[PDB]
Amino acid sequence: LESPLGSDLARLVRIWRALIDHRLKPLELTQTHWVTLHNIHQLPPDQSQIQLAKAIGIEQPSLVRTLDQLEDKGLISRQKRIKLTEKAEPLIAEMEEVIHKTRGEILAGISSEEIELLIKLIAKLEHNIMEL
Amino acid sequence: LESPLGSDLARLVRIWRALIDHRLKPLELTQTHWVTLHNIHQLPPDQSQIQLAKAIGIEQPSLVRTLDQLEDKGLISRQKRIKLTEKAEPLIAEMEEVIHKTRGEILAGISSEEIELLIKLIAKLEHNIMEL
Ligand SMILES: O=C(O)c1ccccc1O
Ligand SMILES: O=C(O)c1ccccc1O
Ligand SMILES: O=C(O)c1ccccc1O
Ligand SMILES: O=C(O)c1ccccc1O
Ligand SMILES: O=C(O)c1ccccc1O
Ligand SMILES: O=C(O)c1ccccc1O
């Protein structure tokens, strides 16, 4: 088709992130940090590095500086598997609450069956991509 | 809702970009560079800095290093308005061809009326976001 789908989506995702970044600044989480912690939070327990980078859609080595920092601030433990600490729990719970609440306002006036099709479509687009 | 829409989209967009990045590496365009040139290309002629950052969904100062480089390699001219040069034309045309062609393969088996709803939905999501 003619329509610039990938850059429409890429803009949307940038402005949605930027809204969240603003709302989370008091927590002085940077983008990369909350993105990565959120991702850890929505995965099941004990992810390998490799599962995490994949769920994010990035390549490990970029993941590693971000993880190293989080480990430095004691947010995260590794023994290569990944566990949120006791110490990150209040920070996470408040982060997730702002993210959840922002999603409810973003999703306002969009029907569940419309959101359900978006999700199934995202899936197919990604499958095409991975198949290449 | 419960569903992690923003990170689904953010993954999709990361893996779609990464596919394009791979395909464009022979041209040794970096991500930021092709993203920005593509954006310039799909806009009407002579954008201000400000229109460009907005179409991308970023804030000007990040835009500026990238533009400075492009101007250094003679891809781009400014007099604060922005014009692709004569010299960038073959590079652009080949870039756009790879992007266009990648979109056709990504969009395979998805109906036009389904792609048309995605586009209208992206629009509404962004409007909610800007309204905040
Ligand atoms: O601008 C982007 O980030 C982008 C991402 C995927 C496809 C096309 C694009 O312009
Ligand atoms: O792009 C990155 O470097 C990155 C690193 C960690 C988490 C999310 C990210 O996009
Ligand atoms: O909607 C707001 O005003 C807001 C501000 C910060 C965090 C979550 C929010 O909903
Ligand atoms: O992971 C992201 O980049 C992201 C972007 C917007 C909303 C939620 C997210 O996790
Ligand atoms: O995030 C950036 O710094 C950036 C800069 C120029 C173009 C696209 C971008 O995402
Ligand atoms: O599909 C491919 O093999 C390909 C490779 C590079 C550029 C555009 C493409 O379609």
Author numbering:
A (entry chain A), B (entry chain A): 2 to 80, 89 to 141
Which of the paper's sentences describe this entry?
MarR TFs typically function as environmentally responsive repressors of genes encoding efflux pumps that export xenobiotics, including many antimicrobial agents, and are defined by the presence of a winged helix-turn-helix (wHTH) DNA-binding domain. Although this contrasts with the classical repressive role of MarR TFs, work in our and other laboratories has demonstrated that SlyA positively regulates genes by a countersilencing mechanism, in which repression of AT-rich promoters by the histone-like nucleoid-associated protein H-NS is relieved by SlyA. Here we show that SlyA has retained an ability to undergo conformational changes in response to aromatic carboxylates, regulate gene expression in an environmentally responsive manner, and repress the expression of a linked drug efflux system.
To further analyze the mechanism of allosteric inhibition of SlyA, the structure of the salicylate-SlyA cocrystal was determined. Studies by other groups have previously determined the structure of apo-SlyA and the SlyA bound to DNA, demonstrating that SlyA is similar in overall structure to other MarR proteins, consisting of six alpha helices. Dolan et al. previously observed that the two recognition helices of the apo-SlyA dimer are only ∼15 Å apart, in a closed conformation. SlyA, like other MarR family TFs, is subject to allosteric inhibition by small aromatic carboxylate compounds such as salicylate, which bind and stabilize the SlyA dimer in a conformation unfavorable for DNA binding. Although the general structure and architecture of the salicylate-SlyA complex are similar to complexes formed by other MarR TFs, including MarR and MTH313 from Methanobacterium thermoautotrophicum, the various TFs differ significantly in their specific interactions with salicylate.
